């Protein structure tokens, strides 16, 4: 059912070494990401995200996005600041994009409140203001959401600028991975 208290889950957003991030731009990504989840199935009853904005010594070896994320997730496993928090959610953030204007990446279906471990729930996101909702889309993937046929959904495969989950399938998956059950209502 509804838990006795919302679970504290940290979303730890690490500025890539060498990147320059701007405050309003990163704030927009983090608030859009938080709101995209809280808007679903009354999820503030189940989770209160602490978005943490910090830094990392890691930088992607190139513009190769898959290489970049594989290296970022590995870097977390021996990052002394992240010790004891292998069950949280992590984003590497930069100003620009990756090769061919890739906007972000994520490990799909990598966070569940019961099994989270080993820094598996991790991804990367641009923060440029012209790409609202990228972190929210990647967080959706981390929570198990798949691409949708509806082009007005946050989880359309193509960037559209939209910010909200519309797919009932995705909303059920995301909420289930955060402890929700259908009998709980919204």
């Amino acid at each position, epitope marked *: 059912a509804v838990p006795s208290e919302p679970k504290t889950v940290y979303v730890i957003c690490l500025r890539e070494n060498g990147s320059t991030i701007y405050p309003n731009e990163v704030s927009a990504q983090m608030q859009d990401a938080a709101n995209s989840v809280y808007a679903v199935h009354g999820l503030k009853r189940y989770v209160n995200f602490h978005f943490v904005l910090y830094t990392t010594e890691y930088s992607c070896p190139s513009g190769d*996005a898959k290489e970049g994320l594989e290296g970022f997730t590995a870097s977390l496993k021996s990052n002394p600041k992240a010790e004891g928090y292998d069950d949280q959610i992590y984003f590497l953030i930069r100003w620009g994009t990756w090769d061919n204007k890739i906007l972000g990446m994520s490990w799909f279906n990598s966070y569940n409140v019961n099994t989270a471990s080993d820094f598996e729930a991790s991804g990367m996101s641009t923060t440029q203001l012209m790409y609202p909702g990228v972190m929210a889309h990647e967080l959706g993937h981390i929570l198990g959401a798949e691409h949708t046929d509806n082009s007005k959904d946050l989880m359309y495969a193509t960037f559209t600028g939209y910010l909200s989950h519309l797919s009932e399938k995705n909303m059920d998956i995301i909420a289930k991975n955060l402890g929700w059950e259908a009998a709980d209502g919204d």
Partner: nanobody
Amino acid sequence: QVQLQESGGGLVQAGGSLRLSCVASGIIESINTFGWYRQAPGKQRELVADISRWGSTNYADSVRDRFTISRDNAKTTLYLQMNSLKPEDTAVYYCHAETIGYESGAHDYWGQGTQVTVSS
């Protein structure tokens, strides 16, 4: 997921004007950048003018203040007003749309090209 069709080319004399039009059909909100490219014989294709989904425009230095790009309210039609034309503007002009996948990046869609010939 989008289809582009452009028109308006022709032969004009130096100093003349032409107005190009491009109509997009399909998933219009997938268009991140809507624009015009051109290719002249022996030369590489080059950006002429484009407009972002947020309304920001870019022009090639050589056409700034002679050409104007615009997009209609419905977002399906792109215009290129070409004034004060020069022989250096002779080219096949292509309508273009960039889509961006969150994880996959940019994909290019093209029109068929419309020939522009500027005689002197």
